[PDB]
């Protein structure tokens, strides 16, 4: 049995911004998957020994989202509450540049995100050092597609 | 099985994983 904690970034279908409200903690067992009930216990560096834990609920709706089928997954309009907008995964910045003024300090050029593209996975094959309203975020080689197709 | 490939498109990126006894 396995425990996972998840982080997300809002994805923009055009002008408006959307974000998927998947559960914060999802527990897997290889053959079985279920949401972590409460996670009201300390996580030691040695591993996971929850002093107060019990059996977890089952739900085919939300669980199937994590099974790879995003058609019937969580969905939430986040225009009012922007929330997370850029994350660093695999050393490749994941940002929703359609609503954040992301820039590259290698040349000062603005990165253009078009409605046909939802998320831009900026890598070092086009931006060695990136700078979103801050300081040097050194990005390594590519590990992700440059963007995600709308369809 | 969490297909990490499809969750990444909608922005869901795994940030930590472990096991419990």
């Amino acid at each position: 049995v396995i425990v996972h904690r998840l982080e997300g970034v809002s994805y923009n279908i055009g002008s408006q911004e959307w974000y998927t409200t998947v559960p914060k903690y999802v527990a897997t067992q290889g053959y079985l998957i279920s949401n972590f009930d409460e996670s009201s216990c300390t996580f030691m560096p040695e591993g996971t020994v929850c002093s107060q834990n019990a059996l977890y609920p089952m739900s085919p709706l939300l669980q199937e989202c994590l099974r790879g089928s995003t058609k019937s997954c969580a969905r939430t309009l986040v225009s009012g509450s922007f929330g997370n907008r850029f994350i660093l995964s695999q050393g490749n910045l994941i940002a929703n540049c359609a609503s954040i003024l992301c820039k590259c300090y290698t040349t000062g050029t603005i990165i253009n995100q078009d409605p046909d593209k939802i998320l831009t996975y900026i890598a070092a094959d086009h931006c060695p050092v990136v700078e979103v309203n801050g300081v040097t975020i050194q990005v390594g080689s590519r590990r992700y597609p440059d963007a995600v197709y709308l369809h | 099985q969490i297909h990490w490939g499809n969750l990444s498109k909608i922005g869901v990126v795994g940030i930590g994983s472990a096991s419990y006894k």
């Epitope: 897997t28 695999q90 050393g91 590519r142 590990r143 | 990490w4 490939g5 994983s17 472990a18």
Partner: antibody, heavy 121, light 103 residues
Framework: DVQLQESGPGLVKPSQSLSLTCTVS?????????WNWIRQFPGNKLEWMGY???????GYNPSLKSRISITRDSSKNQFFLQLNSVTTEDTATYYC??????????????WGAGTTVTVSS | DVQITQSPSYLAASPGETITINCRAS??????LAWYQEKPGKTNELLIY???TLQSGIPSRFRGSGSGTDFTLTISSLEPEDFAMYYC?????????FGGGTK
Amino acid sequence: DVQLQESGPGLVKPSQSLSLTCTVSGYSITSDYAWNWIRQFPGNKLEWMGYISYTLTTGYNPSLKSRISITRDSSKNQFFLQLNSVTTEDTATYYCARSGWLLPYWYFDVWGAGTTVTVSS
Amino acid sequence: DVQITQSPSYLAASPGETITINCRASKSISKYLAWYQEKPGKTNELLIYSGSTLQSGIPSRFRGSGSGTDFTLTISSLEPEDFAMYYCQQHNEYTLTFGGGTK
């Protein structure tokens, strides 16, 4: 920076399991990426065996799948290999490499120095 | 059933000229091919990953190319320290297949 220096017993006897330990130093193994074991046979031919992602998902080479397994550790920044039912032609040099967990873009960036595993009398 | 065949198993060289190494497949793998340089007594260093991208810190001499099934590898202005074994690896599907050596 990130370095990988593996070690293990290279004098395994035929028809018993082997053991290989890779000590990832300079970067945590549970943060991200995927960790791999690659071996090259005598003859410079390389083969890919299996991966341990940052999460606890794991797949192996279909040829070796029935007798291979990948583990890890958290307090110690290491991930191991237990391959049982060793036959005559499992002798090779086993390498430690780091790659992304997404397919495609599965290329190996940092490699290990390598160690020699022999299967003989 | 992806099998990668690297044709030039041996190639001579001299300091100051260009040499082309090739690799071939049997099923289309797009532009996804990588090139690793193995100096003796050191760790393998990737040079070109998917497409023809220079890895950060790798000299501009090495130049990837190719698409679909047949790729190449071009080295310009061979310095006396550029002699090692160059392998190619396809990273589009599983059963990740490498290639033969080169000198």
